[PDB]
Amino acid sequence: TGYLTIGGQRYQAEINDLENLGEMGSGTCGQVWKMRFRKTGHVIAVKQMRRSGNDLDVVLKSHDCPYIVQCFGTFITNTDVFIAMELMGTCAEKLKKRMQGPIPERILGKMTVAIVKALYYLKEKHGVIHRDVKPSNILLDERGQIKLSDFGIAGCAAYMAPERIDPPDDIRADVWSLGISLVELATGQFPYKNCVLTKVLQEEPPLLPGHMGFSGDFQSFVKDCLTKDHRKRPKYNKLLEHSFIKRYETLEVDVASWFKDVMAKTE
Secondary structure (H helix, E strand, C coil): CCEEEECCEEEECCHHHCEEEEEECCCCCCCEEEEEECCCCEEEEEEEEECCCCCCCCCHHHCCCCCECCEEEEEECCCEEEEEECCCCEEHHHHHHHHCCCCCHHHHHHHHHHHHHHHHHHHHHHCCCCCCCCHHHEEECCCCCEEECCCCCCCCCCCCCCCCCCCCCCCCHHHHHHHHHHHHHHHCCCCCCCCCCCHHHHCCCCCCCCCCCCCHHHHHHHHHHCCCCCCCCCCHHHHCCCHHHHHHHHCCCCHHHHHHHHCCCCC
């Protein structure tokens, strides 16, 4: 906030001080740059957004978690807002479009661990509900790391839990989005008939195809997350003891390589 913290020290800095190194089209949205903070020598990402009508400052107290993309600070001009954050590879969304094929169970397994531990961290440590868990906001990288990108507070965002129609008043709606995301990448196809998308509350939850060769535990984990009564749908605490997790918690999986390998294409 006119101030940038990296390597565990807080510096005054100014957005215009940074070395722009050219853009990227594929972050949390497509308005993001790659730059360098001259003062420490670090190379970062800088999301740039036009200012609107109108403050969730406390994104930086989350340095603790290795599954949440570090935010270094923020800047304002009379026209835009710049949020500065650690540099990453790409959405899962991109990976899907790019491969036009499914993501392997075992990558999803690591992903799944990482996304849950992230959400847990937020609920516990910061009383947060991410409320926007989808493949666009899950970032992977060259070294094999997988992280949640916390976006703060017609197939356009049909990851909504079916528990959003009984007012008047959040805990585990995030869990449902998780499941949808898993189904989507695991199969490489957003499950639902195109329009809009009201089969959500109609149908039996869109579980994982019986014989694409997924493990039973994966299948289980996905069913559990995809429970129509939020009442019955599991908390993170429980998910984290689900064996799928317990497994990918421990199993060696070369995400680093896979990821690199999947970057043998244009785009």
